[PDB]
Amino acid sequence: GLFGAIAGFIEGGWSGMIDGWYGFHHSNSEGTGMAADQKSTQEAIDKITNKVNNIVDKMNREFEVVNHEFSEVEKRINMINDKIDDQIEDLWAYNAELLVLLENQKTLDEHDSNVKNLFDEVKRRLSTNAIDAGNGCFDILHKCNNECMETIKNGTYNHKEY
């Protein structure tokens, strides 16, 4: 994808992550954990919610096609009326189809960006105290207990301590 994270440097998703789109796995001496990151997840939810509400609002403006009857000596007017209804319907078909193809492209790329940004956010916070494995994982060069781990996840980790 555009940002190279989803189906990219992180090769696959986690089937265990049900309550969120993006999150963390950790392993230390005290054991193992996997949980959604609620901040990055909720930011993404707000954005797609805004997009959906905008798509619904821009497609629900008042519109009506009253069918009309014409005499056998009103063939030109009958054809003109049919042209209006066909050509306006045709322009709305373009708008609806193109908007879904365009926004589906962006939505999937926006998710890819969200994953890359979360990864980059952790990489900078860890700085020289961690080795990049190149699969979305960091090997921490010091002992990092559950307190240290939560400090990385919620973004209060100060690399100068270690």
Partner: protein, 328 residues
Amino acid sequence: DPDRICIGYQSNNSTDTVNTLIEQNVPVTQTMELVETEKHPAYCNTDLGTPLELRDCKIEAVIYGNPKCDIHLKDQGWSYIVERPSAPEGMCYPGSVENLEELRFVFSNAASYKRIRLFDYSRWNVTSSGTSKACNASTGGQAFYRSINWLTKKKPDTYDFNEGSYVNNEDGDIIFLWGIHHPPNTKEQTTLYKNANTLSSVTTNTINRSFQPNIGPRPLVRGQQGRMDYYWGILKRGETLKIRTNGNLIAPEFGYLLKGESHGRIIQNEDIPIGNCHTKCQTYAGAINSSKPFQNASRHYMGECPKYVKKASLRLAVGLRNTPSIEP
């Protein structure tokens, strides 16, 4: 051995796929369908009321009062009109309605009508309430239109210039209706109306129309070589309708006091039944109950409806690209 932290994203068992500008059938974790394809195939009530179903009679047959349509003589209201194409009864006596499309429009765009008596032709100096085999009642006997009255000469060879006034003192505009009968022979003209050429005038505050008969044999239609031209007008609040004839006038008897505004639709459909249902969205292919932005039911609808698209499906990505899962 070293302590580890990993960034990951959701994979799930969703079979949902979307199309993007650059990619077909992309699997994604969460989607929403934007096209409503479910509907109730019936003609339901709306907030404007119940549809008027015309199984037996076209609209002009009801307005002019074709004597097979007496069920529709009652004061009535509607949200829209369902006119069955198979409805056999139109104008019973052969002839055309001038500006028929505009009459059906103004009638159907109203919410209801009251039948108002404009004239009583029992007190007139003519033989009134003429009948025809062309216009049989439902009970079998020969009859005529209920809204317009066939005036012929008084029996001892008399048809003078008869005239009358009606003043619209009702709370709205009235559709009034009349006909001009054209006999096939000059013999029939004199045996019905006495005068070989007649002047029939229909006038109001704004309209000024006069009619002479055009004698000559027309092709046989429903057993008649004679022909009627049918006419209509609108008498506004406070206006006076004046009629004057010495023959050939099929004179206005009952007008239609229009009230309010319906959806102003005439649906020409055979096989979709009227339903005992209420809907926010009535399309011409049935009722829709949906918050989806689009529907593929019909481009013709009334109420608050999703936009029409001729497409089976428009699936919108909500979640992310669905990938085969890896172990954390």
